[PDB]
Design a protein around this ligand. Structure first.
Ligand SMILES: Nc1nc2c(ncn2[C@@H]2O[C@@H]3COP(=O)(O)O[C@H]4[C@@H](O)[C@H](n5cnc6c(=O)[nH]c(N)nc65)O[C@@H]4COP(=O)(O)O[C@H]3[C@H]2O)c(=O)[nH]1
Ligand SMILES: Nc1nc2c(ncn2[C@@H]2O[C@@H]3COP(=O)(O)O[C@H]4[C@@H](O)[C@H](n5cnc6c(=O)[nH]c(N)nc65)O[C@@H]4COP(=O)(O)O[C@H]3[C@H]2O)c(=O)[nH]1
Ligand code: NA
Ligand code: NA
Length: 279
């Protein structure tokens, strides 16, 4: 949950820097700091990874007395070949390598850990570094549609690799009298990290997709409940959201879901296509 704030705080940093510098370079220190905090790291470095999946030897940022990086170190190479976090056998001078991998499988950067306290050298920690690293990779990377598809892929990976839930709402706006105003209300209701996408379904109707990443069934209930109150303010208490021609479809992503089940929701049920949302 501290996760929300960190990502949100980073996203803000991204949005408020000049083009006169690539994000990874400007935010190297911040990114390392985030990772250092979540893994209670003591000695580590952050490195750019090249298109050819080899790291730039010169670190973007370091923490403590980080040694020169050995690019031929098997741990680095195994991490970079697999695109996955790798750690040394706990029974047995890097201790862990964590790649920053975006949703397309491109590796942007490498966290190399020389030392972390023995007692945070476990799967729960590794999981957290890996979750955070993937999200960070995303942020470093049609605007609205591209972003929506990326975040959606991220959520699929998070549910699949880590069992983290997410929720997808589709708001079909069937009464043109209120369509624009309903959308405006939803857009103004937006939490950072949540993403929205305006579309037209195959029946020619306006649809507003809302993706709530990292959000449990209870969270999605809290959200919708917050919305009904906003709606009651905007169109009066006497009026229900549905009486404004709004139809709700909801899809919970979780460990037991699949890309195929999600596609069925987007295309078969919501009536969208893969030119609108990439799965
Ligand atoms: N009632 C409610 N409204 C929500 C919720 N999530 C988003 N919103 C609404 O969406 C706006 C933006 O949220 P944010 O982008 O995540 O950005 C937020 C967030 O960065 C931060 N913030 C405020 N309260 C909290 C909080 O209880 N926890 C965390 N982690 N951050 C908060 O302040 C920013 C703006 O806060 P707001 O001015 O209130 O403005 C909020 C609020 O109007 C929610 O769970 N409940
Ligand atoms: N993904 C997503 N989830 C949402 C949204 N709105 C509500 N939820 C979920 O519903 C729970 C309770 O919402 P809340 O009643 O507004 O109760 C909120 C609200 O009162 C307050 N809060 C958090 N963030 C903000 C904010 O940015 N602005 C304001 N005004 N209040 C916030 O803290 C309470 C708890 O926040 P949470 O622990 O995060 O728990 C939230 C959250 O899991 C949303 O726009 N997006
Ligand atoms: Na519908
Ligand atoms: Na299609």
């Amino acid at each position: 949950q501290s996760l929300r704030s960190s990502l949100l705080g980073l996203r803000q940093l991204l949005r408020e820097l000049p083009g006169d510098e690539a994000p990874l370079d400007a935010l190297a220190e911040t990114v390392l700091a985030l990772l250092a905090q979540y893994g209670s790291l003591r000695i580590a470095g952050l490195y750019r990874v090249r298109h050819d999946r080899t790291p730039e030897p010169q670190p973007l940022a370091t923490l403590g007395e980080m040694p020169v990086l050995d690019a031929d170190d098997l741990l680095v190479r195994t991490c970079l070949e697999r695109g996955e976090l790798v750690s040394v056998r706990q029974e047995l001078a890097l201790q862990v390598c964590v790649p920053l991998v975006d949703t397309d499988g491109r590796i942007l950067a490498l966290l190399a850990v020389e030392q972390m306290p023995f007692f945070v050298f476990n799967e729960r920690t590794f999981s957290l570094l890996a979750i955070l690293a993937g999200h960070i990779a995303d942020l470093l990377q049609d605007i609205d549609a591209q972003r929506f598809s990326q975040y959606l892929k991220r959520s699929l990976l998070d549910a699949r690799d880590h069992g983290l839930p997410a929720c997808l709402y589709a708001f079909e706006l069937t009464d043109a009298r209120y369509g624009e105003e309903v959308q405006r209300l939803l857009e103004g209701s937006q939490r950072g990290l949540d993403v929205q996408l305006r579309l037209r379904n195959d029946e020619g109707r306006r649809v507003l997709l809302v993706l709530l990443p990292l959000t449990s069934a209870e969270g999605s209930q809290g959200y919708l409940q917050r919305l009904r109150i906003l709606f009651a303010e905007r169109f009066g208490q006497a009026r229900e959201l549905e009486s404004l021609g709004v139809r709700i479809r909801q899809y919970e992503l979780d460990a037991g879901n699949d890309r195929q089940a999600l596609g069925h929701f987007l295309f078969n049920e919501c009536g969208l296509n893969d030119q609108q949302v990439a799965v």
